[PDB]
Design a protein around this ligand. Structure first.
Ligand code: HEC
Ligand code: HEC
Lengths: 108, 108
């Protein structure tokens, strides 16, 4: 792709220090600030039920792939102007590779 | 995305008139000229086992999504220079939407 696997272990701790505050990844995990992410790869944005997404997310209608996911994490608001996800971004491709590697595995 | 659903019925007959000559879509379907396509969405290119892909396909390492799939079908060789898939292309977005709609459903 334009994405290369990293460390799922490293990615797990990135998740805990940078995403856990607002999300869960487990099947049967609840929505918190942000939606539960189980089964996000291959799904379009704004389709988790029981979650109130912004108009922005839903209309962007991104199809979530490891590659899309990478550009999004770099700068969320640049990618989805108007999204209420208050996360600065993950600048280093190495960090992003690790995180996505972790996500691809735990959200399945 | 940049893809919108069509007619899976229309897409099924497009498949039969334009792709069947070289591919199968069913789980447990055999490779023919081209590889069996069961479970192609979310998979990267050149990963079907027992199939001899060109160097081109494998190194392109496309992650197959309905959107990627669309650009590919427009013009395969323009998209994967050196691919041995001898298919001209599907010029109309309407045709492509229908086909991909069919594929998303039958390759799952
Ligand atoms: C709270 C401060 C958040 C943190 C930290 C992270 N995310 Fe988030 N995310 C949050 C919200 C409120 C939302 C919904 C946005 C809206 O505008 O409706 C999101 C959304 C996502 C998405 C899109 C999901 C979809 O179903 O379309 C993804 C893929 C996502 N968030 C992932 C994610 C990751 C991996 C994070 C750590 C780097 C992360 N987010 C941080 C809130 C918050
Ligand atoms: C024989 C004349 C073909 C027709 C008609 C179609 N395809 Fe094909 N396809 C063919 C070959 C020999 C190969 C392998 C290419 C290589 O260079 O190794 C392919 C490949 C694909 C792929 C990539 C699959 C992967 O696993 O990476 C896809 C997604 C694909 N073909 C789909 C497809 C569709 C939907 C067609 C009808 C419009 C179609 N192909 C026509 C041979 C032939």
């Amino acid at each position: 792709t334009e994405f290369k696997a990293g460390s799922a272990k490293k990615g797990a701790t990135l998740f805990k220090t940078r995403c856990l505050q607002c999300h869960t990844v487990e099947k049967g995990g609840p929505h918190k600030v942000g939606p539960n992410l189980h089964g996000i790869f291959g799904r379009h944005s704004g389709q988790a039920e029981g979650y109130s997404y912004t108009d922005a997310n839903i209309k962007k209608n991104v199809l979530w792939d490891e590659n899309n996911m990478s550009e999004y994490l770099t700068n969320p608001k640049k990618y989805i102007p108007g999204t209420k996800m208050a996360f600065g971004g993950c600048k280093k491709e190495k960090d992003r590779n690790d995180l996505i590697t972790y996500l691809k595995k735990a959200t399945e």
